[PDB]
Amino acid sequence: GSSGSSGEHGLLVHKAVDKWTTEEVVLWLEQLGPWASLYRDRFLSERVNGRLLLTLTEEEFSRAPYTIENSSHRRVILTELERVRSGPSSG
């Protein structure tokens, strides 16, 4: 509807993370916690898109520029990612 910019909190998973955009990428991460705003800047500047968000591993995250000097932060991203990326099996 007329809710802020074009985006909904739910279709995230329904839509492959490898198809997300520099926008959705930050939006999904901006939900894991309020601290996401401390990294979001690095996501936009680096135009880190979904396809790239998935490629990024525990290391990459700990490596600059992100140099995420906080494990907890990586655990939140990597984990949450494993969810949005991995959908229902149905088998």
PDB file of N, CA and C in Angstrom:
ATOM      1  N   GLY A   1       0.807  -1.207   0.000  1.00  0.00           N
ATOM      2  CA  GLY A   1       0.000   0.000   0.000  1.00  0.00           C
ATOM      3  C   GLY A   1       0.842   1.260   0.000  1.00  0.00           C
ATOM      4  N   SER A   2       0.365   2.289   0.694  1.00  0.00           N
ATOM      5  CA  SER A   2       1.079   3.559   0.767  1.00  0.00           C
ATOM      6  C   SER A   2       2.010   3.589   1.976  1.00  0.00           C
ATOM      7  N   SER A   3       2.701   2.479   2.211  1.00  0.00           N
ATOM      8  CA  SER A   3       3.623   2.375   3.336  1.00  0.00           C
ATOM      9  C   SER A   3       5.048   2.703   2.902  1.00  0.00           C
ATOM     10  N   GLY A   4       5.516   3.891   3.273  1.00  0.00           N
ATOM     11  CA  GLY A   4       6.858   4.306   2.914  1.00  0.00           C
ATOM     12  C   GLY A   4       7.250   3.859   1.518  1.00  0.00           C
ATOM     13  N   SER A   5       8.546   3.671   1.300  1.00  0.00           N
ATOM     14  CA  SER A   5       9.050   3.247  -0.001  1.00  0.00           C
ATOM     15  C   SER A   5       8.485   1.883  -0.384  1.00  0.00           C
ATOM     16  N   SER A   6       8.750   1.465  -1.618  1.00  0.00           N
ATOM     17  CA  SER A   6       8.265   0.181  -2.111  1.00  0.00           C
ATOM     18  C   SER A   6       8.968  -0.973  -1.401  1.00  0.00           C
ATOM     19  N   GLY A   7       8.247  -1.629  -0.497  1.00  0.00           N
ATOM     20  CA  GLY A   7       8.816  -2.744   0.238  1.00  0.00           C
ATOM     21  C   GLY A   7       7.876  -3.281   1.299  1.00  0.00           C
ATOM     22  N   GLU A   8       7.886  -4.596   1.486  1.00  0.00           N
ATOM     23  CA  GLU A   8       7.024  -5.233   2.475  1.00  0.00           C
ATOM     24  C   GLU A   8       7.820  -6.199   3.349  1.00  0.00           C
ATOM     25  N   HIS A   9       7.502  -6.221   4.639  1.00  0.00           N
ATOM     26  CA  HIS A   9       8.186  -7.100   5.580  1.00  0.00           C
ATOM     27  C   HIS A   9       7.520  -8.473   5.625  1.00  0.00           C
ATOM     28  N   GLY A  10       7.930  -9.353   4.717  1.00  0.00           N
ATOM     29  CA  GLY A  10       7.362 -10.688   4.669  1.00  0.00           C
ATOM     30  C   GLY A  10       7.760 -11.442   3.416  1.00  0.00           C
ATOM     31  N   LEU A  11       7.677 -10.772   2.272  1.00  0.00           N
ATOM     32  CA  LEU A  11       8.030 -11.388   0.998  1.00  0.00           C
ATOM     33  C   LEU A  11       9.535 -11.615   0.901  1.00  0.00           C
ATOM     34  N   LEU A  12      10.269 -11.105   1.883  1.00  0.00           N
ATOM     35  CA  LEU A  12      11.721 -11.254   1.912  1.00  0.00           C
ATOM     36  C   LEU A  12      12.126 -12.693   1.607  1.00  0.00           C
ATOM     37  N   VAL A  13      11.661 -13.621   2.437  1.00  0.00           N
ATOM     38  CA  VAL A  13      11.973 -15.034   2.256  1.00  0.00           C
ATOM     39  C   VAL A  13      11.392 -15.561   0.948  1.00  0.00           C
ATOM     40  N   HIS A  14      10.127 -15.236   0.695  1.00  0.00           N
ATOM     41  CA  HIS A  14       9.455 -15.676  -0.521  1.00  0.00           C
ATOM     42  C   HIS A  14      10.299 -15.363  -1.753  1.00  0.00           C
ATOM     43  N   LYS A  15      11.061 -14.278  -1.682  1.00  0.00           N
ATOM     44  CA  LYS A  15      11.916 -13.868  -2.790  1.00  0.00           C
ATOM     45  C   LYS A  15      13.371 -14.237  -2.520  1.00  0.00           C
ATOM     46  N   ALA A  16      13.965 -14.989  -3.442  1.00  0.00           N
ATOM     47  CA  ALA A  16      15.354 -15.409  -3.304  1.00  0.00           C
ATOM     48  C   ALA A  16      16.241 -14.242  -2.883  1.00  0.00           C
ATOM     49  N   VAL A  17      17.144 -14.501  -1.942  1.00  0.00           N
ATOM     50  CA  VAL A  17      18.053 -13.472  -1.451  1.00  0.00           C
ATOM     51  C   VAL A  17      19.046 -13.056  -2.530  1.00  0.00           C
ATOM     52  N   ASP A  18      19.278 -13.946  -3.487  1.00  0.00           N
ATOM     53  CA  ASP A  18      20.206 -13.671  -4.579  1.00  0.00           C
ATOM     54  C   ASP A  18      19.567 -12.753  -5.616  1.00  0.00           C
ATOM     55  N   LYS A  19      18.323 -12.360  -5.365  1.00  0.00           N
ATOM     56  CA  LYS A  19      17.599 -11.482  -6.277  1.00  0.00           C
ATOM     57  C   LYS A  19      17.292 -10.143  -5.613  1.00  0.00           C
ATOM     58  N   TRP A  20      17.659 -10.021  -4.343  1.00  0.00           N
ATOM     59  CA  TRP A  20      17.424  -8.791  -3.595  1.00  0.00           C
ATOM     60  C   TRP A  20      18.221  -7.633  -4.186  1.00  0.00           C
ATOM     61  N   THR A  21      17.912  -6.419  -3.742  1.00  0.00           N
ATOM     62  CA  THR A  21      18.600  -5.229  -4.228  1.00  0.00           C
ATOM     63  C   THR A  21      19.257  -4.467  -3.083  1.00  0.00           C
ATOM     64  N   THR A  22      20.203  -3.597  -3.424  1.00  0.00           N
ATOM     65  CA  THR A  22      20.908  -2.805  -2.424  1.00  0.00           C
ATOM     66  C   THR A  22      19.947  -2.264  -1.372  1.00  0.00           C
ATOM     67  N   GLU A  23      18.675  -2.150  -1.741  1.00  0.00           N
ATOM     68  CA  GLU A  23      17.657  -1.645  -0.827  1.00  0.00           C
ATOM     69  C   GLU A  23      17.173  -2.748   0.110  1.00  0.00           C
ATOM     70  N   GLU A  24      16.597  -3.798  -0.467  1.00  0.00           N
ATOM     71  CA  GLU A  24      16.090  -4.918   0.316  1.00  0.00           C
ATOM     72  C   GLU A  24      17.183  -5.494   1.212  1.00  0.00           C
ATOM     73  N   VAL A  25      18.396  -5.578   0.677  1.00  0.00           N
ATOM     74  CA  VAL A  25      19.529  -6.109   1.427  1.00  0.00           C
ATOM     75  C   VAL A  25      19.677  -5.403   2.770  1.00  0.00           C
ATOM     76  N   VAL A  26      19.591  -4.077   2.748  1.00  0.00           N
ATOM     77  CA  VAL A  26      19.714  -3.283   3.964  1.00  0.00           C
ATOM     78  C   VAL A  26      18.445  -3.365   4.806  1.00  0.00           C
ATOM     79  N   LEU A  27      17.304  -3.468   4.134  1.00  0.00           N
ATOM     80  CA  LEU A  27      16.018  -3.556   4.820  1.00  0.00           C
ATOM     81  C   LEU A  27      15.940  -4.818   5.672  1.00  0.00           C
ATOM     82  N   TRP A  28      16.286  -5.951   5.072  1.00  0.00           N
ATOM     83  CA  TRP A  28      16.257  -7.228   5.777  1.00  0.00           C
ATOM     84  C   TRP A  28      17.220  -7.219   6.959  1.00  0.00           C
ATOM     85  N   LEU A  29      18.384  -6.610   6.764  1.00  0.00           N
ATOM     86  CA  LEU A  29      19.392  -6.532   7.815  1.00  0.00           C
ATOM     87  C   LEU A  29      19.004  -5.497   8.866  1.00  0.00           C
ATOM     88  N   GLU A  30      18.187  -4.528   8.462  1.00  0.00           N
ATOM     89  CA  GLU A  30      17.740  -3.478   9.370  1.00  0.00           C
ATOM     90  C   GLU A  30      16.619  -3.982  10.273  1.00  0.00           C
ATOM     91  N   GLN A  31      16.327  -5.275  10.181  1.00  0.00           N
ATOM     92  CA  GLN A  31      15.275  -5.880  10.989  1.00  0.00           C
ATOM     93  C   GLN A  31      15.867  -6.775  12.073  1.00  0.00           C
ATOM     94  N   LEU A  32      17.059  -7.302  11.812  1.00  0.00           N
ATOM     95  CA  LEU A  32      17.736  -8.175  12.766  1.00  0.00           C
ATOM     96  C   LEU A  32      18.052  -7.428  14.058  1.00  0.00           C
ATOM     97  N   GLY A  33      18.205  -6.112  13.953  1.00  0.00           N
ATOM     98  CA  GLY A  33      18.506  -5.304  15.120  1.00  0.00           C
ATOM     99  C   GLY A  33      18.745  -3.848  14.772  1.00  0.00           C
ATOM    100  N   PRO A  34      18.691  -2.976  15.790  1.00  0.00           N
ATOM    101  CA  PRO A  34      18.900  -1.536  15.611  1.00  0.00           C
ATOM    102  C   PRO A  34      20.346  -1.198  15.268  1.00  0.00           C
ATOM    103  N   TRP A  35      21.253  -2.118  15.577  1.00  0.00           N
ATOM    104  CA  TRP A  35      22.671  -1.916  15.301  1.00  0.00           C
ATOM    105  C   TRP A  35      22.957  -2.035  13.807  1.00  0.00           C
ATOM    106  N   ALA A  36      21.988  -2.560  13.064  1.00  0.00           N
ATOM    107  CA  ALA A  36      22.136  -2.726  11.624  1.00  0.00           C
ATOM    108  C   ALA A  36      22.446  -1.394  10.947  1.00  0.00           C
ATOM    109  N   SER A  37      21.994  -0.305  11.559  1.00  0.00           N
ATOM    110  CA  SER A  37      22.220   1.028  11.013  1.00  0.00           C
ATOM    111  C   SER A  37      23.698   1.402  11.086  1.00  0.00           C
ATOM    112  N   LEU A  38      24.455   0.646  11.873  1.00  0.00           N
ATOM    113  CA  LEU A  38      25.883   0.896  12.030  1.00  0.00           C
ATOM    114  C   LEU A  38      26.677   0.248  10.900  1.00  0.00           C
ATOM    115  N   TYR A  39      26.020  -0.630  10.151  1.00  0.00           N
ATOM    116  CA  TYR A  39      26.664  -1.320   9.039  1.00  0.00           C
ATOM    117  C   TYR A  39      25.982  -0.980   7.718  1.00  0.00           C
ATOM    118  N   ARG A  40      24.684  -0.705   7.784  1.00  0.00           N
ATOM    119  CA  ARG A  40      23.913  -0.366   6.594  1.00  0.00           C
ATOM    120  C   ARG A  40      24.713   0.551   5.671  1.00  0.00           C
ATOM    121  N   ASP A  41      25.350   1.558   6.256  1.00  0.00           N
ATOM    122  CA  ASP A  41      26.149   2.506   5.487  1.00  0.00           C
ATOM    123  C   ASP A  41      27.149   1.777   4.595  1.00  0.00           C
ATOM    124  N   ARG A  42      27.750   0.719   5.132  1.00  0.00           N
ATOM    125  CA  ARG A  42      28.728  -0.064   4.385  1.00  0.00           C
ATOM    126  C   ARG A  42      28.046  -0.891   3.298  1.00  0.00           C
ATOM    127  N   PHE A  43      26.766  -1.183   3.500  1.00  0.00           N
ATOM    128  CA  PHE A  43      26.001  -1.968   2.539  1.00  0.00           C
ATOM    129  C   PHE A  43      25.610  -1.121   1.331  1.00  0.00           C
ATOM    130  N   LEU A  44      25.201   0.115   1.592  1.00  0.00           N
ATOM    131  CA  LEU A  44      24.799   1.028   0.527  1.00  0.00           C
ATOM    132  C   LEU A  44      26.011   1.513  -0.261  1.00  0.00           C
ATOM    133  N   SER A  45      26.986   2.074   0.449  1.00  0.00           N
ATOM    134  CA  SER A  45      28.198   2.579  -0.185  1.00  0.00           C
ATOM    135  C   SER A  45      28.834   1.513  -1.072  1.00  0.00           C
ATOM    136  N   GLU A  46      28.908   0.291  -0.555  1.00  0.00           N
ATOM    137  CA  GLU A  46      29.494  -0.819  -1.301  1.00  0.00           C
ATOM    138  C   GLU A  46      28.458  -1.469  -2.212  1.00  0.00           C
ATOM    139  N   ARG A  47      27.319  -0.804  -2.374  1.00  0.00           N
ATOM    140  CA  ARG A  47      26.247  -1.318  -3.216  1.00  0.00           C
ATOM    141  C   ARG A  47      26.084  -2.824  -3.033  1.00  0.00           C
ATOM    142  N   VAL A  48      26.316  -3.294  -1.811  1.00  0.00           N
ATOM    143  CA  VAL A  48      26.195  -4.714  -1.502  1.00  0.00           C
ATOM    144  C   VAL A  48      24.781  -5.215  -1.767  1.00  0.00           C
ATOM    145  N   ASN A  49      24.610  -5.931  -2.873  1.00  0.00           N
ATOM    146  CA  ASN A  49      23.305  -6.470  -3.241  1.00  0.00           C
ATOM    147  C   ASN A  49      23.103  -7.859  -2.646  1.00  0.00           C
ATOM    148  N   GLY A  50      21.905  -8.408  -2.831  1.00  0.00           N
ATOM    149  CA  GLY A  50      21.605  -9.728  -2.307  1.00  0.00           C
ATOM    150  C   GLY A  50      22.588 -10.778  -2.785  1.00  0.00           C
ATOM    151  N   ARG A  51      22.695 -10.931  -4.100  1.00  0.00           N
ATOM    152  CA  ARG A  51      23.603 -11.910  -4.685  1.00  0.00           C
ATOM    153  C   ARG A  51      24.974 -11.847  -4.018  1.00  0.00           C
ATOM    154  N   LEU A  52      25.403 -10.637  -3.675  1.00  0.00           N
ATOM    155  CA  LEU A  52      26.697 -10.438  -3.030  1.00  0.00           C
ATOM    156  C   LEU A  52      26.609 -10.722  -1.534  1.00  0.00           C
ATOM    157  N   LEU A  53      25.456 -10.424  -0.947  1.00  0.00           N
ATOM    158  CA  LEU A  53      25.242 -10.649   0.478  1.00  0.00           C
ATOM    159  C   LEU A  53      25.393 -12.126   0.825  1.00  0.00           C
ATOM    160  N   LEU A  54      24.936 -12.989  -0.075  1.00  0.00           N
ATOM    161  CA  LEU A  54      25.022 -14.431   0.134  1.00  0.00           C
ATOM    162  C   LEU A  54      26.462 -14.915  -0.001  1.00  0.00           C
ATOM    163  N   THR A  55      27.171 -14.379  -0.990  1.00  0.00           N
ATOM    164  CA  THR A  55      28.558 -14.755  -1.228  1.00  0.00           C
ATOM    165  C   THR A  55      29.427 -14.446  -0.013  1.00  0.00           C
ATOM    166  N   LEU A  56      29.173 -13.302   0.614  1.00  0.00           N
ATOM    167  CA  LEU A  56      29.932 -12.890   1.789  1.00  0.00           C
ATOM    168  C   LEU A  56      29.876 -13.959   2.876  1.00  0.00           C
ATOM    169  N   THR A  57      31.046 -14.373   3.354  1.00  0.00           N
ATOM    170  CA  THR A  57      31.131 -15.388   4.395  1.00  0.00           C
ATOM    171  C   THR A  57      31.619 -14.790   5.709  1.00  0.00           C
ATOM    172  N   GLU A  58      31.574 -15.589   6.771  1.00  0.00           N
ATOM    173  CA  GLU A  58      32.011 -15.136   8.086  1.00  0.00           C
ATOM    174  C   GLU A  58      33.281 -14.297   7.978  1.00  0.00           C
ATOM    175  N   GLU A  59      34.231 -14.771   7.176  1.00  0.00           N
ATOM    176  CA  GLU A  59      35.492 -14.066   6.987  1.00  0.00           C
ATOM    177  C   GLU A  59      35.261 -12.700   6.348  1.00  0.00           C
ATOM    178  N   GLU A  60      34.831 -12.706   5.090  1.00  0.00           N
ATOM    179  CA  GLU A  60      34.574 -11.468   4.364  1.00  0.00           C
ATOM    180  C   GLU A  60      33.985 -10.407   5.291  1.00  0.00           C
ATOM    181  N   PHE A  61      32.998 -10.806   6.085  1.00  0.00           N
ATOM    182  CA  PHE A  61      32.348  -9.890   7.016  1.00  0.00           C
ATOM    183  C   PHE A  61      33.350  -9.343   8.028  1.00  0.00           C
ATOM    184  N   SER A  62      34.219 -10.217   8.526  1.00  0.00           N
ATOM    185  CA  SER A  62      35.225  -9.823   9.505  1.00  0.00           C
ATOM    186  C   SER A  62      36.351  -9.039   8.839  1.00  0.00           C
ATOM    187  N   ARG A  63      36.396  -9.090   7.512  1.00  0.00           N
ATOM    188  CA  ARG A  63      37.423  -8.386   6.754  1.00  0.00           C
ATOM    189  C   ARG A  63      36.907  -7.038   6.260  1.00  0.00           C
ATOM    190  N   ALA A  64      37.806  -6.064   6.166  1.00  0.00           N
ATOM    191  CA  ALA A  64      37.442  -4.729   5.705  1.00  0.00           C
ATOM    192  C   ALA A  64      36.802  -4.781   4.323  1.00  0.00           C
ATOM    193  N   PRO A  65      36.099  -3.700   3.954  1.00  0.00           N
ATOM    194  CA  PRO A  65      35.943  -2.527   4.817  1.00  0.00           C
ATOM    195  C   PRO A  65      35.059  -2.810   6.027  1.00  0.00           C
ATOM    196  N   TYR A  66      34.126  -3.743   5.867  1.00  0.00           N
ATOM    197  CA  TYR A  66      33.216  -4.106   6.946  1.00  0.00           C
ATOM    198  C   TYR A  66      33.979  -4.352   8.244  1.00  0.00           C
ATOM    199  N   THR A  67      35.091  -5.074   8.141  1.00  0.00           N
ATOM    200  CA  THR A  67      35.912  -5.383   9.304  1.00  0.00           C
ATOM    201  C   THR A  67      35.055  -5.551  10.553  1.00  0.00           C
ATOM    202  N   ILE A  68      33.882  -6.151  10.383  1.00  0.00           N
ATOM    203  CA  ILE A  68      32.970  -6.374  11.499  1.00  0.00           C
ATOM    204  C   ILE A  68      33.711  -6.925  12.712  1.00  0.00           C
ATOM    205  N   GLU A  69      34.137  -6.028  13.596  1.00  0.00           N
ATOM    206  CA  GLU A  69      34.858  -6.424  14.800  1.00  0.00           C
ATOM    207  C   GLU A  69      33.891  -6.886  15.885  1.00  0.00           C
ATOM    208  N   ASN A  70      32.882  -7.654  15.484  1.00  0.00           N
ATOM    209  CA  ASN A  70      31.887  -8.161  16.422  1.00  0.00           C
ATOM    210  C   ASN A  70      31.251  -9.444  15.898  1.00  0.00           C
ATOM    211  N   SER A  71      31.628 -10.571  16.493  1.00  0.00           N
ATOM    212  CA  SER A  71      31.097 -11.867  16.085  1.00  0.00           C
ATOM    213  C   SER A  71      29.571 -11.853  16.087  1.00  0.00           C
ATOM    214  N   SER A  72      28.990 -11.558  17.245  1.00  0.00           N
ATOM    215  CA  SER A  72      27.539 -11.514  17.383  1.00  0.00           C
ATOM    216  C   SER A  72      26.891 -10.943  16.126  1.00  0.00           C
ATOM    217  N   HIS A  73      27.486  -9.882  15.590  1.00  0.00           N
ATOM    218  CA  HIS A  73      26.967  -9.241  14.387  1.00  0.00           C
ATOM    219  C   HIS A  73      26.955 -10.216  13.214  1.00  0.00           C
ATOM    220  N   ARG A  74      28.043 -10.962  13.060  1.00  0.00           N
ATOM    221  CA  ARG A  74      28.159 -11.931  11.978  1.00  0.00           C
ATOM    222  C   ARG A  74      27.181 -13.085  12.174  1.00  0.00           C
ATOM    223  N   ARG A  75      27.031 -13.522  13.420  1.00  0.00           N
ATOM    224  CA  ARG A  75      26.127 -14.620  13.741  1.00  0.00           C
ATOM    225  C   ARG A  75      24.689 -14.264  13.380  1.00  0.00           C
ATOM    226  N   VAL A  76      24.332 -12.998  13.569  1.00  0.00           N
ATOM    227  CA  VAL A  76      22.986 -12.527  13.264  1.00  0.00           C
ATOM    228  C   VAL A  76      22.736 -12.519  11.760  1.00  0.00           C
ATOM    229  N   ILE A  77      23.711 -12.022  11.006  1.00  0.00           N
ATOM    230  CA  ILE A  77      23.596 -11.960   9.554  1.00  0.00           C
ATOM    231  C   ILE A  77      23.632 -13.354   8.939  1.00  0.00           C
ATOM    232  N   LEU A  78      24.758 -14.040   9.105  1.00  0.00           N
ATOM    233  CA  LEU A  78      24.920 -15.387   8.567  1.00  0.00           C
ATOM    234  C   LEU A  78      23.704 -16.250   8.886  1.00  0.00           C
ATOM    235  N   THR A  79      23.340 -16.301  10.165  1.00  0.00           N
ATOM    236  CA  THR A  79      22.195 -17.089  10.602  1.00  0.00           C
ATOM    237  C   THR A  79      20.930 -16.683   9.855  1.00  0.00           C
ATOM    238  N   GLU A  80      20.458 -15.467  10.118  1.00  0.00           N
ATOM    239  CA  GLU A  80      19.255 -14.959   9.470  1.00  0.00           C
ATOM    240  C   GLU A  80      19.287 -15.235   7.970  1.00  0.00           C
ATOM    241  N   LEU A  81      20.465 -15.091   7.373  1.00  0.00           N
ATOM    242  CA  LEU A  81      20.632 -15.324   5.942  1.00  0.00           C
ATOM    243  C   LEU A  81      20.304 -16.769   5.584  1.00  0.00           C
ATOM    244  N   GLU A  82      20.804 -17.702   6.389  1.00  0.00           N
ATOM    245  CA  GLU A  82      20.563 -19.121   6.157  1.00  0.00           C
ATOM    246  C   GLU A  82      19.067 -19.424   6.153  1.00  0.00           C
ATOM    247  N   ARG A  83      18.281 -18.504   6.702  1.00  0.00           N
ATOM    248  CA  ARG A  83      16.835 -18.674   6.764  1.00  0.00           C
ATOM    249  C   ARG A  83      16.169 -18.134   5.502  1.00  0.00           C
ATOM    250  N   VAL A  84      16.406 -16.858   5.213  1.00  0.00           N
ATOM    251  CA  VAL A  84      15.830 -16.220   4.035  1.00  0.00           C
ATOM    252  C   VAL A  84      16.296 -16.908   2.757  1.00  0.00           C
ATOM    253  N   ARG A  85      17.515 -17.436   2.785  1.00  0.00           N
ATOM    254  CA  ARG A  85      18.078 -18.120   1.627  1.00  0.00           C
ATOM    255  C   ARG A  85      17.499 -19.524   1.490  1.00  0.00           C
ATOM    256  N   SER A  86      17.389 -20.226   2.614  1.00  0.00           N
ATOM    257  CA  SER A  86      16.854 -21.582   2.619  1.00  0.00           C
ATOM    258  C   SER A  86      15.351 -21.573   2.880  1.00  0.00           C
ATOM    259  N   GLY A  87      14.579 -21.970   1.873  1.00  0.00           N
ATOM    260  CA  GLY A  87      13.135 -21.999   2.012  1.00  0.00           C
ATOM    261  C   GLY A  87      12.619 -23.367   2.414  1.00  0.00           C
ATOM    262  N   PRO A  88      11.306 -23.582   2.242  1.00  0.00           N
ATOM    263  CA  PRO A  88      10.661 -24.854   2.586  1.00  0.00           C
ATOM    264  C   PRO A  88      11.071 -25.983   1.647  1.00  0.00           C
ATOM    265  N   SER A  89      11.361 -27.147   2.221  1.00  0.00           N
ATOM    266  CA  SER A  89      11.769 -28.306   1.434  1.00  0.00           C
ATOM    267  C   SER A  89      10.584 -28.890   0.673  1.00  0.00           C
ATOM    268  N   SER A  90       9.551 -29.284   1.411  1.00  0.00           N
ATOM    269  CA  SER A  90       8.357 -29.864   0.807  1.00  0.00           C
ATOM    270  C   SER A  90       8.692 -31.161   0.077  1.00  0.00           C
ATOM    271  N   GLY A  91       9.321 -32.090   0.792  1.00  0.00           N
ATOM    272  CA  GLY A  91       9.688 -33.361   0.198  1.00  0.00           C
ATOM    273  C   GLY A  91       9.432 -34.532   1.127  1.00  0.00           C
TER     274      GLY A  91
END
